[PDB]
Design a binder for this molecule. Structure first.
Ligand SMILES: CCCCCCCCCCCCOC[C@H]1O[C@H](O[C@H]2O[C@H](CO)[C@@H](O)[C@H](O)[C@H]2O)[C@H](O)[C@@H](O)[C@@H]1O
Ligand SMILES: CCCCCCCCCCCCOC[C@H]1O[C@H](O[C@H]2O[C@H](CO)[C@@H](O)[C@H](O)[C@H]2O)[C@H](O)[C@@H](O)[C@@H]1O
Ligand SMILES: CCCCCCCCCCCCOC[C@H]1O[C@H](O[C@H]2O[C@H](CO)[C@@H](O)[C@H](O)[C@H]2O)[C@H](O)[C@@H](O)[C@@H]1O
Ligand SMILES: CCCCCCCCCCCCOC[C@H]1O[C@H](O[C@H]2O[C@H](CO)[C@@H](O)[C@H](O)[C@H]2O)[C@H](O)[C@@H](O)[C@@H]1O
Ligand SMILES: CCCCCCCCCCCCOC[C@H]1O[C@H](O[C@H]2O[C@H](CO)[C@@H](O)[C@H](O)[C@H]2O)[C@H](O)[C@@H](O)[C@@H]1O
Ligand SMILES: CC1(C)CCC(NC(=O)c2cc3c(F)cc(F)cc3[nH]2)CC1
Ligand SMILES: NC(=O)CN(CC(=O)O)CC(=O)O
Ligand SMILES: NC(=O)CN(CC(=O)O)CC(=O)O
Length: 900
């Protein structure tokens, strides 16, 4: 159950109101770009955890009661100049005055600065550890004002340009906020790299697909408008829910490629239609009714592959899904609205500026036809070989290693952890809230301490079990509610956290006390647990929805399951290569990244994206061969028809997407490189190994079993437009005796009854013709009978005329119907007067024949019908009548009015 009257109406309307469409939509997209440029100041960095988890609740309660830990905010390593020591009093005074000046300039942003450098004369052992033994290095802590991570990072970015100058520039800034600033600036770095690299390369690839300036420029303008509008839409979404930083490059990584590919396909189809003889109006309408439907289906598939990411609670994945959906649907809309109207405005002008203005698949698919096993199993084994590294993939959180190993901030952090060990901690926290509301006594604290000392593997520095699990510090941003007490202690081995947490949560709390196990390891592990808990349902929804959409698009049952297994193998192989590249470290030396576990939500993101890519390409390809089997073509060449019709467009689209993805593989963010490399691997696997080799071979393996659909999941074959409806359009269908423009009695489709003025003589003739007492009224089927009689009489008259018989025997059924139309209108004597025109048609020179027919006085006197018939001659389709200028007014009886 499909619907194309909607697409036909829109193809008509976008040509009818093309200027309004182009103006309104371009204005909306440009205003959206102007409104969404400011998205960079409204994105967030949170959303990596499960915010409905116990670790997040523990973190929130600890923040409320004790205050958030601002000690890891800013760390500053200071080194005296000229091999001096940190004990030089003049240098001490200088640096201290500099730091005081920096803090009092930004009291709105900095809380203060805390170190050993502030109180050199002290005995506190922890403070005296902020200096190295050599007295060549000393680090300080600079807490910042703020209430959420984004405001704190903004305050740090406000204070950094002046804080960096301290100590003659020889101050090294590490901590949470410097790393955050670098990791977020990676996004803008990638944006600028894309602007510089992909735009001219995409221009070149387009200009090589279309040997024309305009036909190659249109998809680029479409992609630009799509990026602008999608950024505006994400800026609007930022008003309701937090949008993550990583959602910005997605718009440029995924949105731009699909938008330009949509534009490429639509412009190519418009050029096909124009080169097939249709004028601009019919070209736009058919371009819609075919390629726009394909594009909308593509967008629906991408949305169906993205939506399941809304199951995971990580707002990171949610904002990414929002960005994907917005970009893709806006690209589809622009492709069937700005681009359609722009083509309707330009016309054949889209080929005006050639190359000078700037200054075979069938053979290869037949190579796979002879021996399918020679390419199928030797490729399936290679893919299941690439799958085995996928098994040994690990997951982890965000560290300094997400930056390249030569990044100054990562090296500053690693030098801090070398010079000052024991300050960077990941302690697990037991948070105790008393449900009743009264203070917590030391007895309950001791009970919890003992029940925690039950568990092993926790750090015991000075070897005193009654000093482990010390109390969390408390600063001024905490309520200090006596009903909440937090103990905490680090882990000897981090890889045991997921177990120890599961132990610390099995401990029985004191009576009337609620226990929450939190901390950075607990946050990470609970996030990963939510991810793995919700993954199978996501995969099931993905596969089921995509397979149902393939049930809709294919009209088959074998092909959806086949393409599902194909996409599964492609996803597995791509993720195996990704594990081999980023976990096992292969390719790291050339790309300059550190091998490490992947970000957990990136696994679901990459699953969704790669599955959508594979399914989209498989659908767009296989539909073209289902087209041929619907026409009646044989299997072994229906495959060839589809593959050869898709080759150039598929390769160009894959090339543009590969350009845009390789523009991002050079990122300084290991997650960005992971995503872009996975996209590149999946894309180059689908554009070559999947489409060229495995698809035709594995399909031929099933031969004529691939299109088998049971019952009637398959659409019904349409009512084939015939000569009856054509001449009903041109001559009218009247079921009651009427007078023509000459004043004679006509009925049916231009069937002259008699040239007598008597209505009763005409009724006598009509009753004699039909065989009953009609009273001047006939049914539609009787009109069809009379019309078929007249058509047969005209055909017999044509085969009798020696000037019309050759060209009539030369033509096809549609052009033969056009010739019969001309006969019915103007007599065989009049039709034979088009000697050279009929010669052109007989020689199948449709363009010359149409141009010459449009110069008769037949066109001057009956221009609409003549234009319709001449279009039928030029194209050979009923398209000039399936969507025609409605409403005729003057009915005239035709020649060969058959009596009996
Ligand atoms: C574009 C991609 C780039 C990715 C950038 C990543 C930059 C790294 C910055 C990491 C800042 C971690 O700060 C440490 C903070 O951890 C928790 O706070 C958490 O409390 C919330 C309650 O919801 C939790 O949900 C939040 O995870 C968190 O605010 C502690 O409670 C705070 O005491 C401590 O200060
Ligand atoms: C990606 C993350 C990598 C970066 C991680 C680096 C973590 C940075 C931790 C550095 C801790 C700096 O402060 C540590 C010291 O200060 C506090 O005590 C004192 O501070 C007051 C200052 O006025 C004194 O007056 C009070 O005697 C007393 O409360 C802490 O309680 C102690 O532990 C320690 O002595
Ligand atoms: C405001 C929100 C409103 C709800 C969302 C917007 C409306 C969604 C309308 C439904 C989706 C329209 O697409 C669904 C498409 O499925 C098939 O596609 C195929 O049609 C091409 C014709 O040539 C073939 O070539 C290809 O094999 C293949 O694309 C069917 O033939 C049609 O049913 C329809 O074209
Ligand atoms: C600057 C422009 C960069 C262009 C961007 C696109 C480049 C994509 C590259 C992805 C391929 C990953 O390749 C990684 C492999 O390459 C090298 O193999 C090492 O072992 C082999 C046998 O001993 C020898 O072939 C090498 O000599 C030896 O280096 C690496 O060392 C290995 O970890 C890993 O095997
Ligand atoms: C067969 C045809 C295939 C097409 C050829 C593929 C393109 C290969 C030729 C162009 C490669 C030139 O790369 C230029 C790159 O310079 C920089 O590199 C710096 O960042 C990376 C990690 O730190 C490391 O590359 C370096 O260590 C570091 O200098 C930046 O990354 C970008 O400004 C830019 O992207
Ligand atoms: C002619 C075409 C209609 C063929 C499919 C072409 N489809 C893509 O190029 C494509 C990109 C893409 C992506 F980045 C993510 C994702 F989940 C799915 C994706 N499909 C468009 C042009
Ligand atoms: N265009 C036609 O119908 C053929 N005509 C028109 C023409 O001179 O080209 C020639 C002829 O009838 O002799
Ligand atoms: N639309 C009309 O009634 C006039 N004509 C159509 C035309 O002008 O081409 C009808 C016909 O001649 O069959």
């Amino acid at each position: 159950f499909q619907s194309n009257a909607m697409f036909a109406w829109w193809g008509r309307t976008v040509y009818q109101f093309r200027y309004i469409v182009i103006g309104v939509m371009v204005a909306l997209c440009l205003g959206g770009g102007v409104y969404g440029i400011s998205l960079g100041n409204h994105v967030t960095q949170s959303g990596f955890y499960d915010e409905g988890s116990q670790s997040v609740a523990a973190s929130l309660i600890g923040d409320e009661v004790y205050g958030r830990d601002r000690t890891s905010h800013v760390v500053a390593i200071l080194t005296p100049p000229d091999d001096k020591k940190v004990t030089d009093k003049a240098w001490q005074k200088k640096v201290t005055e500099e730091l005081d000046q920096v803090v009092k300039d930004h009291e709105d942003q900095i809380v203060g600065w805390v170190g050993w450098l502030k109180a050199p004369d002290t005995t506190d052992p922890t403070v005296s550890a902020m200096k190295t033994q050599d007295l060549r290095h000393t680090f300080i802590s600079i807490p910042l004002q703020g209430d959420d991570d984004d405001e704190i990072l903004k305050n740090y970015q406000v204070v950094e340009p002046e804080l960096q100058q301290v100590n003659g520039g020889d101050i090294r800034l590490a901590g949470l906020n410097p790393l955050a600033s670098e990791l977020t600036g990676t996004i803008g770095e990638d944006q600028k790299r894309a602007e510089v690299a992909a735009i001219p390369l995409v221009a070149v690839v387009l200009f090589f697909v279309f040997g024309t300036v305009i036909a190659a420029a249109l998809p680029a303008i479409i992609g630009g408008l799509a990026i602008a509008g999608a950024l505006g839409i994400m800026r609007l979404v930022a008003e309701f829910t937090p949008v993550h930083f990583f959602a910005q490059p997605v718009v440029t990584l995924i949105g731009l490629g699909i938008a330009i590919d949509y534009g490429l396909f639509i412009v190519s189809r418009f050029r096909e239609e124009i080169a097939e003889g249709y004028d601009t109006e019919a070209a736009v309408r058919r371009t819609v009714m075919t390629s726009g439907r394909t594009v909308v289906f593509s967008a629906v598939i991408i949305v169906a592959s993205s939506v399941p990411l809304l199951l995971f609670p990580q707002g990171f994945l949610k904002s990414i899904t929002y960005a994907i959906i917005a970009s893709v649907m806006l690209a589809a809309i622009l492709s069937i609205t700005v681009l359609a109207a722009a083509l309707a405005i330009l016309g054949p002008r889209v080929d005006a500026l050639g190359v000078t203005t700037l200054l075979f698949w069938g053979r290869l698919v037949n190579v796979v036809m002879k021996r399918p096993i020679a390419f199928a199993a030797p490729i399936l084994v290679v893919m299941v070989l690439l799958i085995i590294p996928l098994g040994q993939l690990s997951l982890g959180g965000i560290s300094e290693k997400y930056l390249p190993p030569d990044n100054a901030v990562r090296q500053s952090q690693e030098q801090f952890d070398k010079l000052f060990p024991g300050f960077r901690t990941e302690p697990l926290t037991l948070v105790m809230k008393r449900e009743d509301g009264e203070p917590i006594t030391d007895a309950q604290i001791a009970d919890m301490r003992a029940k925690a000392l039950t568990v092993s593997g926790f750090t015991d520095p000075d070897n005193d079990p009654e000093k482990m699990w010390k109390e969390r510090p408390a600063n001024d941003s905490g309520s200090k509610d006596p009903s909440v007490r937090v103990i905490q202690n680090g882990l000897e081995n981090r890889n045991d956290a997921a177990k120890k947490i599961d132990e610390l949560r099995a401990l029985q709390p004191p009576h009337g006390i609620e226990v929450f196990v939190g901390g950075t390891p607990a946050l990470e592990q609970d996030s990963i647990h939510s991810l793995f808990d919700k993954l199978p349902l996501m995969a099931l929804i993905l596969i089921v929805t995509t397979t149902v959409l393939m049930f809709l698009a294919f009209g088959s049952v074998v092909l959806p399951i086949k393409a599902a297994l194909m996409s599964a193998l492609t996803l597995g192989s791509t993720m195996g290569i990704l594990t081999w590249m980023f976990v096992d470290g292969h390719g790291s030396g050339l790309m300059n990244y550190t091998p490490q576990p992947l970000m957990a939500p990136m696994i679901g993101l990459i699953i969704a994206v790669i599955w959508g890519l594979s399914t989209d390409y498989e659908v767009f390809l296989v539909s073209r061969m289902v087209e041929a089997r619907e026409r009646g073509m044989s299997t072994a060449e229906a495959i060839r028809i589809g593959t050869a019709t898709t080759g150039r467009l598929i390769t160009g689209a894959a090339l543009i997407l590969a350009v845009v993805a390789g523009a991002f593989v050079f990122s300084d963010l290991v997650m960005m490189k992971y995503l872009a490399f996975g996209l590149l691997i999946a894309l180059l696997l689908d554009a070559t190994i999947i489409r060229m080799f495995l698809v035709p071979a594995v399909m031929k393996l099933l031969g004529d079993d691939c299109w088998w659909a049971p019952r009637w999941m398959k659409r019904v074959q349409e009512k084939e437009f015939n000569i009856f409806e054509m001449l009903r359009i041109d001559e009218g269908l009247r079921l009651k005796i009427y007078k023509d423009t000459e004043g004679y009695y006509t009925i049916g489709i231009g069937h002259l009854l008699t040239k007598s003025p008597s209505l009763n003589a005409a009724k006598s003739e009509l009753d004699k013709a039909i065989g009953r007492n009609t009273n001047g009224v006939i049914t539609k089927d009787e009109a069809e009978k009379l019309f078929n009689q007249d058509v047969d009489a005209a055909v017999r008259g044509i085969l009798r005329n020696a000037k019309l018989k050759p060209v009539y025997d030369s033509l096809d059924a549609v052009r033969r119907a056009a010739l019969i139309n001309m006969v019915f209108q103007m007599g065989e004597t009049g039709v034979a007067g088009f000697t050279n025109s009929l010669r052109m048609l007989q020689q199948k020179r449709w363009d010359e024949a149409a141009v010459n027919l449009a110069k008769s006085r037949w066109y001057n006197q009956t221009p609409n019908r003549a234009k319709r018939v001449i279009t039928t001659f030029r194209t050979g389709t009923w398209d000039a009548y399936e969507f025609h200028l409605g409403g005729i007014k003057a009915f005239h009886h035709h020649h060969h009015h058959h009596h009996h």
